[PDB]
mmCIF file with all atom_site columns, C-alpha atoms and ligand atoms in Angstrom:
data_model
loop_
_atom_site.group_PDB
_atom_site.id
_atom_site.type_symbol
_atom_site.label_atom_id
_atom_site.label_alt_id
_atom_site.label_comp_id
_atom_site.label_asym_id
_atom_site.label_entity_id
_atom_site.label_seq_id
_atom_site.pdbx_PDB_ins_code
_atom_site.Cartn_x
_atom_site.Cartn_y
_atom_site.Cartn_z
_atom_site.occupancy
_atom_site.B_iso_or_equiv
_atom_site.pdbx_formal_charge
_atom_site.auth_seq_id
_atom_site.auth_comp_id
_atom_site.auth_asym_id
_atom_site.auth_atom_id
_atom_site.pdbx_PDB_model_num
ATOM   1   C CA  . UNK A 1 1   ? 78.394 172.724 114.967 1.00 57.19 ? 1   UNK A CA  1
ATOM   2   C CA  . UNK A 1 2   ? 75.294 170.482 116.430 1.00 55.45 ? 2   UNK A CA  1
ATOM   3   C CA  . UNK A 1 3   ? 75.729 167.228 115.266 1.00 53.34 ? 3   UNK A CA  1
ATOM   4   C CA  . UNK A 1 4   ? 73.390 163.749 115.840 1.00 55.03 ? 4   UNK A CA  1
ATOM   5   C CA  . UNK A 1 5   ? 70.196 165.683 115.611 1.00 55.87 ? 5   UNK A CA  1
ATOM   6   C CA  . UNK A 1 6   ? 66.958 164.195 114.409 1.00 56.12 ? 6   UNK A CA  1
ATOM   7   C CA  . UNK A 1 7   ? 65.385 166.840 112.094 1.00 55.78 ? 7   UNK A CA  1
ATOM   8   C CA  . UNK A 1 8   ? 61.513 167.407 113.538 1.00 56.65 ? 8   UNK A CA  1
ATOM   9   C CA  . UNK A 1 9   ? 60.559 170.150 110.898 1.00 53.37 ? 9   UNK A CA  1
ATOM   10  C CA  . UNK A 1 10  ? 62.337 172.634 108.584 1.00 54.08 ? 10  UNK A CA  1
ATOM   11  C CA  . UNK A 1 11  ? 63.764 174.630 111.596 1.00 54.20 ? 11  UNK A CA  1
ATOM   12  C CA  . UNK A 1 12  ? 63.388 172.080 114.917 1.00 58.29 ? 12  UNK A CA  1
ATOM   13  C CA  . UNK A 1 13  ? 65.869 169.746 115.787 1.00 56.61 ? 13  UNK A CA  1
ATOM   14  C CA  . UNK A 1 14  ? 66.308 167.453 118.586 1.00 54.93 ? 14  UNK A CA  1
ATOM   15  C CA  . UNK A 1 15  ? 68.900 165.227 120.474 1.00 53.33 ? 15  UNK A CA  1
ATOM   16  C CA  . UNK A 1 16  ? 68.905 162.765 123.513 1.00 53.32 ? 16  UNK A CA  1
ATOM   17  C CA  . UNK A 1 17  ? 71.876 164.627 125.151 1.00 56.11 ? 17  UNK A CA  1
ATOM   18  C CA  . UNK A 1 18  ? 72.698 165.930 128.276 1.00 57.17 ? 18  UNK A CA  1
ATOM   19  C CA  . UNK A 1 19  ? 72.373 170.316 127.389 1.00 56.37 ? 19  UNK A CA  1
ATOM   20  C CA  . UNK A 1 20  ? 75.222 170.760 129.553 1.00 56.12 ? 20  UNK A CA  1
ATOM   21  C CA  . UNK A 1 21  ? 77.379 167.940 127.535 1.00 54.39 ? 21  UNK A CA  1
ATOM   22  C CA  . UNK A 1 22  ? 76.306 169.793 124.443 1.00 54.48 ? 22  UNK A CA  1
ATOM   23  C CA  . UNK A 1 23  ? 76.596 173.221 125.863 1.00 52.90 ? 23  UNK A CA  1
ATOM   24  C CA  . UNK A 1 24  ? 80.368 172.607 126.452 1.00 55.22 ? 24  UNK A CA  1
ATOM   25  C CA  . UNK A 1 25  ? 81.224 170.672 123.028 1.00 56.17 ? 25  UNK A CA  1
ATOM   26  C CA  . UNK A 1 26  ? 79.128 173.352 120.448 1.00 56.30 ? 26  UNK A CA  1
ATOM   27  C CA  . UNK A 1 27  ? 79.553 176.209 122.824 1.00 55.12 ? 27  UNK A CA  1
ATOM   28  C CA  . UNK A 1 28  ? 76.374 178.188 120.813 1.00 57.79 ? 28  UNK A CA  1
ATOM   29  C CA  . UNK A 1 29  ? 75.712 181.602 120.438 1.00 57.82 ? 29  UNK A CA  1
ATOM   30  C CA  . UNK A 1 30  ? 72.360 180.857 122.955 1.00 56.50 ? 30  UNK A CA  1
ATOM   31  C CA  . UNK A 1 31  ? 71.608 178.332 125.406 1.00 55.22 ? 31  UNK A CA  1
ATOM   32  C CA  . UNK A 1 32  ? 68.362 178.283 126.812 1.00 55.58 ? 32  UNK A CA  1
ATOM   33  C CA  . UNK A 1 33  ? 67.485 177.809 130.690 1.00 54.08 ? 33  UNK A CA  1
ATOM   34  C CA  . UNK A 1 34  ? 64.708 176.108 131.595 1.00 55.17 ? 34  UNK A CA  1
ATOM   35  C CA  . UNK A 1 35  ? 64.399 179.228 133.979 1.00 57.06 ? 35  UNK A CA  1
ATOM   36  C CA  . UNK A 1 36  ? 61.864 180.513 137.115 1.00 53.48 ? 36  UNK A CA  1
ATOM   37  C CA  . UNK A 1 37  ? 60.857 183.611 137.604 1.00 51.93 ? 37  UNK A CA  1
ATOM   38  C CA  . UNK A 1 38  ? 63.162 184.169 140.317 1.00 52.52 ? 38  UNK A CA  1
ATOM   39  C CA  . UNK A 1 39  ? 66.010 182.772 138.529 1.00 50.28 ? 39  UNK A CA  1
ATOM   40  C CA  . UNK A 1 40  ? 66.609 180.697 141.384 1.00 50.95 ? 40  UNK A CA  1
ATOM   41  C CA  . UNK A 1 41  ? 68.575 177.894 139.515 1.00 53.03 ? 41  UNK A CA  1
ATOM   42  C CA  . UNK A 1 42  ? 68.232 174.812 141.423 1.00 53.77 ? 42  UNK A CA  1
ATOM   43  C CA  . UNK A 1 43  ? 67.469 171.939 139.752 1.00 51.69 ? 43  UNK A CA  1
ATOM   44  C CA  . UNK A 1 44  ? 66.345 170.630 136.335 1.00 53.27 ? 44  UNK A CA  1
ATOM   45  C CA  . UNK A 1 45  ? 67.884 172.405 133.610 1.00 50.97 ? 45  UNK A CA  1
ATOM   46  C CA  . UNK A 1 46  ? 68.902 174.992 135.672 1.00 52.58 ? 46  UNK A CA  1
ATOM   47  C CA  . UNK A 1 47  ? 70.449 173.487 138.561 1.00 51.44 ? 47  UNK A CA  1
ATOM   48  C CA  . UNK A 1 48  ? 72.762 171.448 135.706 1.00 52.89 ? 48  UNK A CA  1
ATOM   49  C CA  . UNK A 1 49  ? 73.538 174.732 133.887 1.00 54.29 ? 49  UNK A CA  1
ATOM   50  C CA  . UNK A 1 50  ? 74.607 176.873 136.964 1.00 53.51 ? 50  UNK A CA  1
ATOM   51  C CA  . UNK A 1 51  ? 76.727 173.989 138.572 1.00 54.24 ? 51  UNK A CA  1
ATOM   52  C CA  . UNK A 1 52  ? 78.632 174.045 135.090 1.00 54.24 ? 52  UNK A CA  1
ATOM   53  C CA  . UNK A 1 53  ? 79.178 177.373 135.537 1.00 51.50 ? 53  UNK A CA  1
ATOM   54  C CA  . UNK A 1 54  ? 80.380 176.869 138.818 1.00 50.67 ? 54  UNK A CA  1
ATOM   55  C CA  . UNK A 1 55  ? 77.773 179.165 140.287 1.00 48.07 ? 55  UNK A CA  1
ATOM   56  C CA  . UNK A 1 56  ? 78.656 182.262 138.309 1.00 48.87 ? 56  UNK A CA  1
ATOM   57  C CA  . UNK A 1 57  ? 75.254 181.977 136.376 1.00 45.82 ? 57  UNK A CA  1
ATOM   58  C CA  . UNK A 1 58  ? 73.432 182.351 140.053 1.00 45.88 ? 58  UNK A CA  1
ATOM   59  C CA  . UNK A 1 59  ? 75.503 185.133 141.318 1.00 48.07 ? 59  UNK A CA  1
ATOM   60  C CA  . UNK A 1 60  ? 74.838 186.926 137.595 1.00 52.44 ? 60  UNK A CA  1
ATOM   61  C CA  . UNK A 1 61  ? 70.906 186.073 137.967 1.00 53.22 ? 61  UNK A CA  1
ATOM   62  C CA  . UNK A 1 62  ? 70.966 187.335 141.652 1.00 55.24 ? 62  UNK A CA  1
ATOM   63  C CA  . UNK A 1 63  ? 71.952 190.644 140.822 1.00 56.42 ? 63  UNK A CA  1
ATOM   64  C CA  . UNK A 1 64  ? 69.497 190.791 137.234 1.00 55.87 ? 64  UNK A CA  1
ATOM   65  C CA  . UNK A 1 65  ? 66.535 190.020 139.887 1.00 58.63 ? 65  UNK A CA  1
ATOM   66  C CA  . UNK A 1 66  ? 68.441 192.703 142.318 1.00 60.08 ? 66  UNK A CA  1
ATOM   67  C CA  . UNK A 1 67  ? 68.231 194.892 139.937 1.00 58.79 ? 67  UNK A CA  1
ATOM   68  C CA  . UNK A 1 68  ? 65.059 194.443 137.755 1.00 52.15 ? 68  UNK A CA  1
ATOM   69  C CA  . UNK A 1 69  ? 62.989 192.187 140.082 1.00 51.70 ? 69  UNK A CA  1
ATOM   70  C CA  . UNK A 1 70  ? 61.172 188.823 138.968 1.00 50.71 ? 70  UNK A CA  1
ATOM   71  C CA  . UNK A 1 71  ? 60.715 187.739 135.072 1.00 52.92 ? 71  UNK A CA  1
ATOM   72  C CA  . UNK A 1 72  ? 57.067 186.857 134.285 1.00 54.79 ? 72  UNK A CA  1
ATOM   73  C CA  . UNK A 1 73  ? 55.621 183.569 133.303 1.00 51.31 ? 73  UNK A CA  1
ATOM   74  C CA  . UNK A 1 74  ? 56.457 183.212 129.676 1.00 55.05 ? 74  UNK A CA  1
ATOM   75  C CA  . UNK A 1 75  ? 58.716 185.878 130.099 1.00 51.99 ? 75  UNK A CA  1
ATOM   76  C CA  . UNK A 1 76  ? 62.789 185.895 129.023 1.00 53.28 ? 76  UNK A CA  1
ATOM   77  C CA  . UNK A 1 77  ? 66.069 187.837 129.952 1.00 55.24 ? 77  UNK A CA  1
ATOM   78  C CA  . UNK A 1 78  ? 69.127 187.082 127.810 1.00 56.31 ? 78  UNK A CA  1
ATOM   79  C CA  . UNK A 1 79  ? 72.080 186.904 130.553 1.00 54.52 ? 79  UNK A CA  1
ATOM   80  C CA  . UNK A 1 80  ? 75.752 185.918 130.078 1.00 56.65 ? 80  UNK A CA  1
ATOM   81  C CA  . UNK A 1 81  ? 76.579 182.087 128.678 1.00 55.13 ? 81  UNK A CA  1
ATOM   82  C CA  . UNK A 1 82  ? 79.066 182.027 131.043 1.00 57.11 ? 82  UNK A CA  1
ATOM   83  C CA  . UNK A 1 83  ? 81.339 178.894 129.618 1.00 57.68 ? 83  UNK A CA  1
ATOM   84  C CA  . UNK A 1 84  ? 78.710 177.006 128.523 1.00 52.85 ? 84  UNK A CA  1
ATOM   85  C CA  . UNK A 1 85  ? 77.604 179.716 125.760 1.00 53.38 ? 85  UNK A CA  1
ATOM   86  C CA  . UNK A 1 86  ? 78.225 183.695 124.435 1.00 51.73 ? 86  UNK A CA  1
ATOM   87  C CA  . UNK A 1 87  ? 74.680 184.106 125.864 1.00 50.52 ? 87  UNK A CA  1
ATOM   88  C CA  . UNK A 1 88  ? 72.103 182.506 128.056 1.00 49.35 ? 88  UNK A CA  1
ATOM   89  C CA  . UNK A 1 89  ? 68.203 182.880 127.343 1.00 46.75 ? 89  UNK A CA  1
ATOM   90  C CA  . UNK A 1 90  ? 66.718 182.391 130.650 1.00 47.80 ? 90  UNK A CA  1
ATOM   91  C CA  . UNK A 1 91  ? 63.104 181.505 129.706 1.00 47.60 ? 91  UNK A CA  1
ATOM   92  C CA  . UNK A 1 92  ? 60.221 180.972 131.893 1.00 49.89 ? 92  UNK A CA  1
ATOM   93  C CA  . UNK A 1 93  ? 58.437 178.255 131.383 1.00 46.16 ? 93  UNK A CA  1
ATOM   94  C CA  . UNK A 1 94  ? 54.552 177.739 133.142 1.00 45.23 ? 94  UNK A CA  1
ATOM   95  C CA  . UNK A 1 95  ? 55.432 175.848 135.908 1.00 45.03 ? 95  UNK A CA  1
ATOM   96  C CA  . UNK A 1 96  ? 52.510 173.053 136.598 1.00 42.73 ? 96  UNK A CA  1
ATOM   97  C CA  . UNK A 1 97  ? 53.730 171.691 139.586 1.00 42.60 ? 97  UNK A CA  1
ATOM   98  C CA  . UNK A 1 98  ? 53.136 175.251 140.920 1.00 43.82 ? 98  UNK A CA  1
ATOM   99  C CA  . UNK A 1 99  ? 49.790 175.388 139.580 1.00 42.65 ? 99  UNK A CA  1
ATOM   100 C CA  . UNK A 1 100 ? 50.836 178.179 136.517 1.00 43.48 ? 100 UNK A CA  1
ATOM   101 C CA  . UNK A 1 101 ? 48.827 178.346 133.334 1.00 43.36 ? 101 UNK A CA  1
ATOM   102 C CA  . UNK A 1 102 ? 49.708 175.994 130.330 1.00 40.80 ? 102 UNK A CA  1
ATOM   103 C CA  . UNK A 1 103 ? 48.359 178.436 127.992 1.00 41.45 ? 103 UNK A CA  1
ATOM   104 C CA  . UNK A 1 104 ? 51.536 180.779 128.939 1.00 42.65 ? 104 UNK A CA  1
ATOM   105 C CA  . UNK A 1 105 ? 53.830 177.681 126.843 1.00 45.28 ? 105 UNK A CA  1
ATOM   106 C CA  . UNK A 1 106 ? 52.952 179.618 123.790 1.00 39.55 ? 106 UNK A CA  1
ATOM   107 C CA  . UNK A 1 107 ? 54.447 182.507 124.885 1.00 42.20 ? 107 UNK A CA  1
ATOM   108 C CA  . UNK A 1 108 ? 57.379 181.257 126.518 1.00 39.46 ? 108 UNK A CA  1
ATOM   109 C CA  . UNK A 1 109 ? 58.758 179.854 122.899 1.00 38.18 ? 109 UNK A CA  1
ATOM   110 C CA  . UNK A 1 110 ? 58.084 182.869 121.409 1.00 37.14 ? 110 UNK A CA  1
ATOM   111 C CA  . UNK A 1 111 ? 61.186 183.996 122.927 1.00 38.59 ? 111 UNK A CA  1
ATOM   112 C CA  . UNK A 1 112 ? 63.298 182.009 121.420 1.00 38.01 ? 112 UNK A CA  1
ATOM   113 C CA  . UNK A 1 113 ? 62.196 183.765 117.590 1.00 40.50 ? 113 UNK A CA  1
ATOM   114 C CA  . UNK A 1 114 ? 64.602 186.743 119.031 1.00 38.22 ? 114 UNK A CA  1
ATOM   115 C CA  . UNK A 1 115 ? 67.162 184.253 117.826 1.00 33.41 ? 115 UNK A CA  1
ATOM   116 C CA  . UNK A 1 116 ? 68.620 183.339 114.880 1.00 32.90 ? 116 UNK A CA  1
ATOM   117 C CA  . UNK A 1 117 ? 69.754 179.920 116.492 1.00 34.08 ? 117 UNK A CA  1
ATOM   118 C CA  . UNK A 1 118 ? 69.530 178.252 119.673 1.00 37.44 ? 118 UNK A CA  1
ATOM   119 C CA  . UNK A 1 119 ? 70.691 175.071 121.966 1.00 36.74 ? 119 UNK A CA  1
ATOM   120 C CA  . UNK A 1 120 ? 67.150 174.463 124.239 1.00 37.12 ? 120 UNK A CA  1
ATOM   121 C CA  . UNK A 1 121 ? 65.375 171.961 126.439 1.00 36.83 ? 121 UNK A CA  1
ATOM   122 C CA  . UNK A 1 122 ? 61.809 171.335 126.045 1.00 38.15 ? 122 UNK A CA  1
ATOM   123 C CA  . UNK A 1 123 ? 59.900 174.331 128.028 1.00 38.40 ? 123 UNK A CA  1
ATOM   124 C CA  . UNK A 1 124 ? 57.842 173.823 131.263 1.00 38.96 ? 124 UNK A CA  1
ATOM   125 C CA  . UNK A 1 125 ? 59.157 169.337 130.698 1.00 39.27 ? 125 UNK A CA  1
ATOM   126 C CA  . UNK A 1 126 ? 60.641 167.633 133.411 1.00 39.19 ? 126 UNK A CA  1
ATOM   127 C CA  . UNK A 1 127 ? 60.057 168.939 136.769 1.00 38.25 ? 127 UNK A CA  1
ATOM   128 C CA  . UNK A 1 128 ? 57.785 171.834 135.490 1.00 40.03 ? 128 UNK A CA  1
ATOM   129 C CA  . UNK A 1 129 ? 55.284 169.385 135.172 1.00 40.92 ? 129 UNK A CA  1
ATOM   130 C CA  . UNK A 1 130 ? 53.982 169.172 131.960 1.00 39.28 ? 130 UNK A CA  1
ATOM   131 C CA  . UNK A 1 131 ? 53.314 166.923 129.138 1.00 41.09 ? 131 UNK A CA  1
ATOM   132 C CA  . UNK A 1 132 ? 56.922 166.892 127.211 1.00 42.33 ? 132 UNK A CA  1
ATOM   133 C CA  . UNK A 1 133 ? 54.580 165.884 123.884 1.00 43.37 ? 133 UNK A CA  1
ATOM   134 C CA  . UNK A 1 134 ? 52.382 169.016 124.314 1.00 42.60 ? 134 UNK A CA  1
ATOM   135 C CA  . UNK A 1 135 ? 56.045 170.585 125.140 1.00 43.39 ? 135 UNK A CA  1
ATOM   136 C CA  . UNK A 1 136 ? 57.220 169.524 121.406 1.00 42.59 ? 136 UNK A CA  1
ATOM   137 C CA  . UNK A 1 137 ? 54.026 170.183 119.882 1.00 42.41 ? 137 UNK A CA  1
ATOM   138 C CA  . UNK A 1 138 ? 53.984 173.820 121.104 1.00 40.22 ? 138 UNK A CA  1
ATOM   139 C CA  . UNK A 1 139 ? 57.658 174.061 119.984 1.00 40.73 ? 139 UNK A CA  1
ATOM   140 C CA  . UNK A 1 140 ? 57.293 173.358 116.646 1.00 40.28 ? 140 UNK A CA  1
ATOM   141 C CA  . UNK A 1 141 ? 54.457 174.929 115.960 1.00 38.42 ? 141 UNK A CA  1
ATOM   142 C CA  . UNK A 1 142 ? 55.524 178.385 118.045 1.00 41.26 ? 142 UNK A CA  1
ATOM   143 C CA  . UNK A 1 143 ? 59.572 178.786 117.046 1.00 39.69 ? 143 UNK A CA  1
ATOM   144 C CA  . UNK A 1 144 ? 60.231 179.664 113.622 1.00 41.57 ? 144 UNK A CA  1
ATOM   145 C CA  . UNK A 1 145 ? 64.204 180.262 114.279 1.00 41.68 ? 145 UNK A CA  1
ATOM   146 C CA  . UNK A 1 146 ? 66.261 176.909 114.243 1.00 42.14 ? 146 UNK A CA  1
ATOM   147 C CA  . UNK A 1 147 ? 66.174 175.291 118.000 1.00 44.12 ? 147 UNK A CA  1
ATOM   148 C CA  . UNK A 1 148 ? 68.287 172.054 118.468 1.00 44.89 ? 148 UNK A CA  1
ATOM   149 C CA  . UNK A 1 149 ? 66.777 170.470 121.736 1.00 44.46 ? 149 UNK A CA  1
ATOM   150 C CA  . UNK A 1 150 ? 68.363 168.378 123.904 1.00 44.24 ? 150 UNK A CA  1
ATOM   151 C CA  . UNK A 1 151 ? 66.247 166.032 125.851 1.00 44.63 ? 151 UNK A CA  1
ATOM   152 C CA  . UNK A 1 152 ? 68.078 163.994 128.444 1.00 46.39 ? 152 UNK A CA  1
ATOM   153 C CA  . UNK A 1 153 ? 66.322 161.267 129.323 1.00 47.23 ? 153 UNK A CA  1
ATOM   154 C CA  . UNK A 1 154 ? 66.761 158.783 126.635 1.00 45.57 ? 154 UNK A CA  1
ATOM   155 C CA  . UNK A 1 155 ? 62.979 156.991 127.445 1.00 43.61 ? 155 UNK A CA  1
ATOM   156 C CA  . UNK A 1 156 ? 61.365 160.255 127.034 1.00 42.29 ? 156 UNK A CA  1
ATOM   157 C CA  . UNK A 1 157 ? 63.412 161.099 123.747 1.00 43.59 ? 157 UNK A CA  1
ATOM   158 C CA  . UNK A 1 158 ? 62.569 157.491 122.133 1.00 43.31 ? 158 UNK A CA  1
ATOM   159 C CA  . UNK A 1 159 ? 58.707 158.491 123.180 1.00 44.66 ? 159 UNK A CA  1
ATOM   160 C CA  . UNK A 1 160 ? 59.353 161.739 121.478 1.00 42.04 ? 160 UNK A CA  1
ATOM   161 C CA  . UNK A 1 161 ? 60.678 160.778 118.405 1.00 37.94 ? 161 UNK A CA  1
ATOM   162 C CA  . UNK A 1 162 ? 57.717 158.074 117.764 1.00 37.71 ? 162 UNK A CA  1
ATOM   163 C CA  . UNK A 1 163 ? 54.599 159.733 118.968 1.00 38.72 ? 163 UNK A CA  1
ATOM   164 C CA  . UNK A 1 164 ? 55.496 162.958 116.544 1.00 39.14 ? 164 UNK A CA  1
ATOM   165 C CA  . UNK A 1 165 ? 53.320 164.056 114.040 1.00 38.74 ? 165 UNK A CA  1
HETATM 166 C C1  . VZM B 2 .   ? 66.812 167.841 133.472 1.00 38.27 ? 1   VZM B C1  1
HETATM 167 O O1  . VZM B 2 .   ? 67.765 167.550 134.494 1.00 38.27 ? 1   VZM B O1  1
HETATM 168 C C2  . VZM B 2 .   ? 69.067 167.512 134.158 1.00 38.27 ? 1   VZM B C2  1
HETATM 169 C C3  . VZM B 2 .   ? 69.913 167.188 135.215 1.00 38.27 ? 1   VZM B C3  1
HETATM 170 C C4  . VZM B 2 .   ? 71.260 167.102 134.948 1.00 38.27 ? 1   VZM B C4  1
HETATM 171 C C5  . VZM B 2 .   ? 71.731 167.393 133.678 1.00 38.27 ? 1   VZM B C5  1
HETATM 172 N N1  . VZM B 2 .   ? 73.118 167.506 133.452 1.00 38.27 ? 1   VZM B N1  1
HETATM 173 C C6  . VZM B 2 .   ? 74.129 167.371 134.369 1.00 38.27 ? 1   VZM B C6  1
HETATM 174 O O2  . VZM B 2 .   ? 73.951 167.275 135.585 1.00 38.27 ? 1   VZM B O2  1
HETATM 175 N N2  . VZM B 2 .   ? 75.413 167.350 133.808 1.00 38.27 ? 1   VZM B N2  1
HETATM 176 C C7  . VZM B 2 .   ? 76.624 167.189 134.493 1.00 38.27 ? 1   VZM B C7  1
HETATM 177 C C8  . VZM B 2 .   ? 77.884 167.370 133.919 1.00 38.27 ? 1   VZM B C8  1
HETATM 178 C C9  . VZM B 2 .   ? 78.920 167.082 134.884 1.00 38.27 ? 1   VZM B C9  1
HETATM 179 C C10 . VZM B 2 .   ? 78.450 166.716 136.102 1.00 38.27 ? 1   VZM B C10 1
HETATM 180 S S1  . VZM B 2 .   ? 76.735 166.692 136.169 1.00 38.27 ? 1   VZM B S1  1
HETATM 181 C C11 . VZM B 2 .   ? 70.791 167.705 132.697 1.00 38.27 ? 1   VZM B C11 1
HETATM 182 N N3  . VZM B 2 .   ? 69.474 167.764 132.920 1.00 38.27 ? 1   VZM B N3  1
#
């Protein structure tokens, strides 16, 4: 199972790890994309995750947004884990680099309580543009199921780790 993980609270967990690394070793029921509404998966989180799939997480996504058109902001869609997972949960994240509303962070975790367990990165971090502490804060305080997340830049996990309340 997930091993090395700091415990945050009774049911978050977290890791400076590379979610495609851990992805491959654990190989959990859910792995979470750091997804777009588009599920246009091209860097970030996503970018990683497709290329380990070797693209087949793209051509999936292609033909979800073929069929059902565009996820919303804080929205979900549980797809195939390809061989990185038995499922992904493709979650959409506000995007503040695109100008999308921070309030919608709430509801993005709130997709991950449709699961009993789950391997995640820290929603709307990175290059969506917000604050990875406000990230963890909402985390915690949103996700009631157990969430190990994997943070991969070790500077940002160290910060993290000591700034939590
Ligand atoms: C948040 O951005 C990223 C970017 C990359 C990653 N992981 C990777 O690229 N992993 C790779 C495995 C083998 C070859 S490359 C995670 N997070």
């Amino acid at each position: 199972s997930f091993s090395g993980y700091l415990k945050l609270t009774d049911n978050v967990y977290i890791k400076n790890a590379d979610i495609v690394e851990e992805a491959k070793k654990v190989k959990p029921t859910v792995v979470v994309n750091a997804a777009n509404v588009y599920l246009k998966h091209g860097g970030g989180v996503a970018g990683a995750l497709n290329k380990a799939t070797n693209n087949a997480m793209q051509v999936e996504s292609d033909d979800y947004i073929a069929t059902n058109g565009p996820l919303k902001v804080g929205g979900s869609c549980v797809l195939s884990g390809h061989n990185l997972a038995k499922h992904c949960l493709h979650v959409v994240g506000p995007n503040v680099n695109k100008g999308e509303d921070i309030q919608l962070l709430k509801s993005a975790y709130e997709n991950f309580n449709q699961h009993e367990v789950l391997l995640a990165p820290l929603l709307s971090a990175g290059i969506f543009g917000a604050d990875p502490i406000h990230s963890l804060r909402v985390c915690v305080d949103t996700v009631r199921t157990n969430v190990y997340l994997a943070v991969f830049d070790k500077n940002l996990y160290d910060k993290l780790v000591s700034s939590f309340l």
